[PDB]
Amino acid sequence: RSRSIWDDAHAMLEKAKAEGISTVWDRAAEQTPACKFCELGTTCRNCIMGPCRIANRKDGKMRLGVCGADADVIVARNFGRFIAGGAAGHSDHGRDLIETLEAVAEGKAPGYTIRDVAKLRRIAAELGVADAATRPAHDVAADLVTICYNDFGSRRNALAFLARAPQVRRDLWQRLGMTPRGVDREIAEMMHRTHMGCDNDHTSLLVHAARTALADGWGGSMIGTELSDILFGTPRPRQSTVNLGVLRKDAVNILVHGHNPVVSEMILAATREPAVRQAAQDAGAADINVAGLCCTGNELLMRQGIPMAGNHLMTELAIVTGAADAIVADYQCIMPSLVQIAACYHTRFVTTSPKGRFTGATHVEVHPHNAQERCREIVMLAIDAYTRRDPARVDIPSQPVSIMSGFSNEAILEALGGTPKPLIDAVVAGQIRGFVGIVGCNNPKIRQDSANVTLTRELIRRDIMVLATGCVTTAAGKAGLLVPEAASKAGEGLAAVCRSLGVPPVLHMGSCVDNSRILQLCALLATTLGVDISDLPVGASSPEWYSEKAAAIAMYAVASGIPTHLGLPPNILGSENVTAMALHGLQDVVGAAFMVEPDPVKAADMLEAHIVARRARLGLT
Amino acid sequence: RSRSIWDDAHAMLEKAKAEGISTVWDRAAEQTPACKFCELGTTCRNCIMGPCRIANRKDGKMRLGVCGADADVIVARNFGRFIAGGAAGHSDHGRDLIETLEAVAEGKAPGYTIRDVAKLRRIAAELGVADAATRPAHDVAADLVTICYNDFGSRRNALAFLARAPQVRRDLWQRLGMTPRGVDREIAEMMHRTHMGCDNDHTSLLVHAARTALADGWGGSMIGTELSDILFGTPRPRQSTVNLGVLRKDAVNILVHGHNPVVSEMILAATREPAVRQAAQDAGAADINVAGLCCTGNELLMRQGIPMAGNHLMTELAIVTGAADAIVADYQCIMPSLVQIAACYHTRFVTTSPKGRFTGATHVEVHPHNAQERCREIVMLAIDAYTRRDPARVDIPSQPVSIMSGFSNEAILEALGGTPKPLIDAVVAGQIRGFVGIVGCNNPKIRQDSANVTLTRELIRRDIMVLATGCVTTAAGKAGLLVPEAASKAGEGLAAVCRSLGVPPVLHMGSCVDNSRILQLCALLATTLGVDISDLPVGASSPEWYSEKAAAIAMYAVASGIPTHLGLPPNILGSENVTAMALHGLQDVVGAAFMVEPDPVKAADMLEAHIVARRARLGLT
Ligand code: SF4
Ligand code: SF4
Ligand SMILES: [Xe]
Ligand SMILES: [Xe]
Ligand SMILES: [Xe]
Ligand SMILES: [Xe]
Ligand SMILES: [Xe]
Ligand SMILES: [Xe]
């Protein structure tokens, strides 16, 4: 119960307890207390002269690694590899989008098209493709593919999308040695620098961690966002629903999980073919019901309006309802426990990526050339599993909650009539005091979504508009804050802006990769006003993060000039020097810093105080 | 004393003890016993739902990570990131060589030339540069640079040098999903796969670890070896000396450390300019004495005959002599303790790489455009530090030992008269029963070089020729086994081959990156005979390894078909499934497996038994 604020979770936790199904919360208890040295970051296993631990003991022993490395170096190396794994999670996704677009450009991807040709030509023109407005769309696409691949090579001095950042920002990065040059290159160089006897200076290591994260935010993730919109459509505001109640007892229920629209968009197509709709009827189902999980669910919500069943700590509970007929997983944040919990039921657990292998799963590998054929086979697996569902163990605990989604930057600018001018006018007038992107996961160390939702309500009450991505999407949707009626929960200034646009006070801007949309928006406003991103009344927050991907997002926010709140510290407190740099030193290096505060009200105060400081620097009330 | 077999080390350990200078051996004692979970690999810190440890306890708790990951997945992920860090250590070195050659090709690198134009044209032709034999050398170089950079991109289906492998080998890799596609790409994908909720199947993870290592051996390292020979000269057999006695009391002593010939070759040039030789005389020195450490020392030994002061556990002791006037470091295996030990003396510790930063060092950053100017400034720093040397604390403990070095494959084939035919004839006749590459470091858990040298003597007595790289170079040289006279220590068949060629029974083939020479030679013989590398009477051994780089070398040897002995296990024993795959399962996957044996005599038996098996499979006595 105290594990979550949500009734639908609470009900499924009782159901799981009675059936003796162990959950992430149960295993989190088993791993408590954790190893102290792992939690502090003062442990190293980068060579077998060790493994080493750094201690603060009276006799003086164990203050240095066998190689002589101290706490500062070891902590910074561990944090660098942490960030690099998060950036890698995003880079490989962007790489898959490049490969998908090239297959469409070559005409080798049945059932795929370029859905947004206008955006294709705009992005291609922006990155330097000649005559992108009038040449055949497939040739334009092939040239865009080439530019994107060059960003995954080793010959550029700066990533292609980095030119969106204001000049003052790029100058700073260049002087600091932070300019990201290559998406994979920066990940590789981080792993190199953290090999023993390479980079042994915590400052140097932290700078390359910022460079690696930037290579994600302005590289892997931004390529991923923009190419997804080209292939699958630019999101436009639309209405949908959220929570475990989006599962229907009377339908074939197919859950997509992971991050890859290249599968999920084609699964959705397969369920619309009239022979497939027929086979589910011949199996007894009223319809075929696709619902989203995690980031692929965020993206299907943004682009098609597909309902979202839950966020990260909802994933196990989504199966305990007994109505999940199949989970279609690709990669990232897919808990391996799901395979065991699925085995307690009729549910098919289907993996589709050669990168996302799970011992004991039904592997049906999906690629652009065979996706239309394989996704149909996958949905046929779900309809068979539907026939084997046990009615005595089905309990869909909730009623779904209405939400509005689809706020790409293109839609935001559309709602403002093509210019950011009305937006900037509202901020100058003090109607919107600032903006905070609330992103990041759930973490069983925090009562699920308590901090996410509490921070959101506080911010909008203070006339701070919230941009929601990732797991916060489900949190704010279940709270009722993703509809225009929620204007009544915002302070007077934000409410009046919200009702004049007919938008909610919390704008869903997509998956964790779509945090690149927030970079793009900040950069646009900074460029429009002639100032740095670190002059904008903005902030970021991850009240309940857990993953390396979220830490990379937090790092590229900070390095880009955005104050960034974290509910929980990364494993760095064993070095006061690294800690002090993350919380303070970075402020006069990149114009922003990390804030660690588990009390969401105090988080709101801190985020709001930074916004006020930036308002005054801009000459605003 | 019992820390090393060597008199020169032993003496310097007494000197360090009397001066109260703590050494790697002392800190190794402090970190003993290590954490059991780190040593077993059953600990995970890849997200802050944890950190987690996997246990085998009666109540059943702590058998799974919070995410549900078990021991098999966690161990395999830790090992994958280990291997990826080793591959990254080599990839970035190869990247720097590409950048150096491009600067030479553009004419933007004063004091650099293409030293081996014949090799440039041969390698360029081999990789597909059109008309590489007759076009201007700089244009050929620019096209080679482009091909190498493409291997550091994301659009190839197989690395360029992989075509050296026999077809049967490439077919196997392709069917297994092991084909390396991109040097940085495979490192990035490994970091992605090991993010939580991605690749959760130990088999899948181990295969991508093999793919990542292959991307090093046939990619990062092979590009690095071949481009170094193009820029700095192909090694030819020559005579030199080894051990701390290569330091001269009467000279300005400059120690190069790390991996980068781009600095060390230019430091050597600076010490030959007549104004620099003059300034050391005006400071009182008889000459300027350059001596090598680690892999840059191996390479300077191979290409210029520069004496080598020591290997990895000699590095601290090289400073305790009191005669080190400067250490010129770049990156990898440079212990941060050296900076503190240098502070106990007059010694200048100079870093030259933006990747190899050390807190408290004199940073003089070297790049191809300014290397000739910066390396001169560096040698001027050494001559100043020479003037401040304390004669009362100088003790050069040994007399140097004569060695022969410089056995590139080009030199081996040269000594055989241009064909491998006489080599193959000796193996068929049973004069050379097989070959073992003994590579890898020192590790203070093993009495220094006891196992390296003991294994070498056993192998050559058994008519098994040894190919030495890395730290083993110093070990076999100090033992007296790197001269043609050492034929008297080999069995009758090898001795007779050795004396007919005037070569030693142990061939120095270079630094740790030059293990790519061994891949090239194996592939050449396999291609010549029409068989796989896993049919050759070959083996590899790392009796005293410590680094991720060495583990990557061991992995790409195994994946390439070469039985590989390790003196110490990597941190994997907490999973019997991963362990059994490394020691046994790999044998029927890739035709070779890891052997873990700390008794070097038993190691010799195991390596020899594999060679006998392959001999019979070939129809040999
Ligand atoms: S790199 Fe240094 S601190 Fe890390 S395990 Fe090796 S010896 Fe210990
Ligand atoms: S990835 Fe899984 S095993 Fe590793 S720390 Fe996170 S929860 Fe624990
Ligand atoms: Xe920093
Ligand atoms: Xe908006
Ligand atoms: Xe906005
Ligand atoms: Xe807005
Ligand atoms: Xe603004
Ligand atoms: Xe923001």
Ligand SMILES: [Xe]
């Ligand atoms: Xe914003």
Ligand SMILES: [Xe]
């Ligand atoms: Xe972080």
Ligand SMILES: [Xe]
């Ligand atoms: Xe964040």
Ligand SMILES: [Xe]
């Ligand atoms: Xe962000």
Ligand SMILES: [Xe]
């Ligand atoms: Xe940091």
Ligand SMILES: [Xe]
């Ligand atoms: Xe932080």
Ligand SMILES: [Xe]
């Ligand atoms: Xe494997």
Ligand SMILES: [Xe]
């Ligand atoms: Xe030889």
Ligand SMILES: [Xe]
């Ligand atoms: Xe050889």
Ligand SMILES: [Xe]
């Ligand atoms: Xe030989």
Ligand SMILES: [Xe]
């Ligand atoms: Xe051979």
Ligand SMILES: [Xe]
């Ligand atoms: Xe070998």
Ligand SMILES: [Xe]
């Ligand atoms: Xe060989």
Ligand SMILES: [Xe]
């Ligand atoms: Xe290894």
Ligand SMILES: [Xe]
């Ligand atoms: Xe090895």
Ligand SMILES: [Xe]
């Ligand atoms: Xe090797």
